[PDB]
């Protein structure tokens, strides 16, 4: 059904995402158990890590487009990523390495993430009908690798330890590299312009140097979130001023402010919602016992299921508004399950969390998928920078919001943690509902401006 290169891209993306979500599923627990962080420290540190992983994304698109070539930058990103996973494995011998390791993973994602998509777009004559199914299938690939990693990494970390989990993330990257290398001939005429001139070692060195400096900067900022906060705060106020000096562009501004809320809420899955499953949910479903950390897998699961269906099935302003309503309902459901459907001992049915993750995945499908493809219709570089910088700030804020559910290490009673989760999730749901109503009200005007 699809070009031959498409399948190579499918599997390279699947395996890289396997490595990344292998780390994301276990990181907050790894901070708490293995490094002795409080839940508050773990949450904000995870926020800063996600902030850097997603804010550096604009670097790798530049490097792929104008310095090294899309294919070369894919390989270089995979190598730096594999290195970072193996360094995280090494952190168990050398705890002082951890932030450097995480810094190395962030720079790697930043270098590699824009580039498979780019390459895939170039596998299709510019108006190929197959394109849309191709990008749906690409998203499904991301979410299959994520589903497997989120399901299995906590089980592996429990049975064999963090060293083996992280080394397997490295192996995932190595097998991404090997499938790319073994399929190189399939993409011989596909690439960006530097892919077909000999590689410039001047520019390759500038990229290695800037990458290393960036690794040390990321490591510092994850160590000192209290100034990552200020860096991103001042950068946001300043670039806000330089966007206000300089109508569809305003449409993007409103949409991004709404996206910020969506990203705050998404940031809850690896932190607050993860600990809510640990502390106040039954760890058994349909008769099987599970690692509650694996509950995070419910996000890619529902995505993998709903994307074909929703591919078969107002337009953009409305689609964003719908996604925000679904998200609101995800957290209101969590709150209701805690307020009215808990056991005498403070535990709730895992079917409530299955439903929470359904609502949140549907919000993801309506906002995320549409967001990126279509911010492009309204508009370039300045706004793209703004998008990444704001998504990143959203992850820092998500970390901060998660800290309102942090539990001290000596609390052992579910009846003490349940009201905390229910209060925070209910307020999140009500604020997101208000944001969704405002969005609905602005839908007609916004649909005017898009004209």
């Amino acid at each position, epitope marked *: 059904q699809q070009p031959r290169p498409f399948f190579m891209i499918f599997f390279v993306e699947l395996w890289e995402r396997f490595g990344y979500y292998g780390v994301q599923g276990v990181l907050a627990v790894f901070f708490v158990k293995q490094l002795g962080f409080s839940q508050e420290q773990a949450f904000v540190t995870f926020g800063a890590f996600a902030a850097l992983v997603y804010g550096l994304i604009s670097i790798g698109g530049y490097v792929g487009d104008h310095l090294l070539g899309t294919k070369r930058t894919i390989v270089l990103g995979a190598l730096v990523l594999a290195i970072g996973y193996f360094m995280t494995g090494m952190s168990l011998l050398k705890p002082d390495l951890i932030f450097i390791a995480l810094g190395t993973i962030a720079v790697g994602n930043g270098l590699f993430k824009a580039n498979p998509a780019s390459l895939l777009s170039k596998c299709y004559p510019p108006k190929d009908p197959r394109l849309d199914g191709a990008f749906t299938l690409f998203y499904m690939s991301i979410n299959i690798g994520s589903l497997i990693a989120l399901s299995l990494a906590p089980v592996i970390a429990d*049975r064999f330890g963090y060293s083996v989990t992280y080394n397997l993330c490295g192996a995932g990257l190595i097998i991404a590299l090997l499938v790319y290398i073994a399929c190189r001939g399939m993409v011989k005429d596909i690439g960006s312009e530097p892919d077909f001139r000999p590689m410039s070692f001047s520019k390759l060195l500038y990229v290695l140097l800037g990458s290393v400096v960036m690794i040390f900067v990321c490591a510092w900022l994850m160590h000192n979130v209290e100034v990552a906060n200020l860096v991103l705060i001042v950068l946001s106020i300043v670039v806000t001023i330089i966007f206000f000096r300089q109508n569809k562009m305003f449409v993007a501004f409103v949409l991004m402010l709404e996206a910020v809320v969506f990203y705050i809420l998404y940031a809850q899955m690896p932190t607050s919602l993860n600990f809510f499953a640990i502390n106040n949910v039954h760890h058994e479903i349909l008769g099987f016992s599970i690692n509650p950390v694996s509950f995070q897998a419910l996000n890619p699961f529902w995505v993998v299921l709903a994307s074909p269906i929703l591919a078969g099935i107002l337009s953009m302003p409305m689609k964003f508004t719908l996604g925000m309503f679904m998200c609101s309902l995800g957290f209101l459901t969590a709150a209701a399950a805690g307020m009215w459907f808990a*056991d*005498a001992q403070g535990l709730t049915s895992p079917w409530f969390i299955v439903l929470v993750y359904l609502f949140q995945s549907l919000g993801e499908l309506f906002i995320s998928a549409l967001g990126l493809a279509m911010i492009a219709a309204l508009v370039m570089g300045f706004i793209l920078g703004m998008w990444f910088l704001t998504q990143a700030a959203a992850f820092l804020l998500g970390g901060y919001v998660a800290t309102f559910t942090a539990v001290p290490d000596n609390i*052992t009673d579910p009846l003490e*943690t349940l009201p905390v989760y229910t209060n925070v999730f209910g307020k999140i749901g009500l604020v997101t509902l208000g944001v969704a109503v405002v969005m609905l009200l602005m839908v007609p005007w916004l649909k005017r401006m898009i004209a």
Partner: nanobody
Amino acid sequence: VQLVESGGGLVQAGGSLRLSCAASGPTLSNYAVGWFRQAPGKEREFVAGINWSSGLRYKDVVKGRFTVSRDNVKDTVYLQMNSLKPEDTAVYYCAARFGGMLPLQPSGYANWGQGTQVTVSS
């Protein structure tokens, strides 16, 4: 996933026993371990437990007599039982739940030992 209890036995009022719980494949360090006990003709009840990060919980009638503790090197959890009285006679079970909570009912726990008999004679 499978726990082994050891150390039960028969002892006189005021004596001491130490139970120990050990796990097979998984690392018990991620688990809160609760000690339950079933006396003849009664339900299992929570007795004492330690979470994955040294939080502790005790049933009221055993406070000041039992201590739960954990040795993370040997991957073992202990229930030291002092000043034993006849009404501590029971089958004792260790149960494991991932994380930091110690819920009071057996349903909050999916992993269970087989039970060791403790008898305290007057």
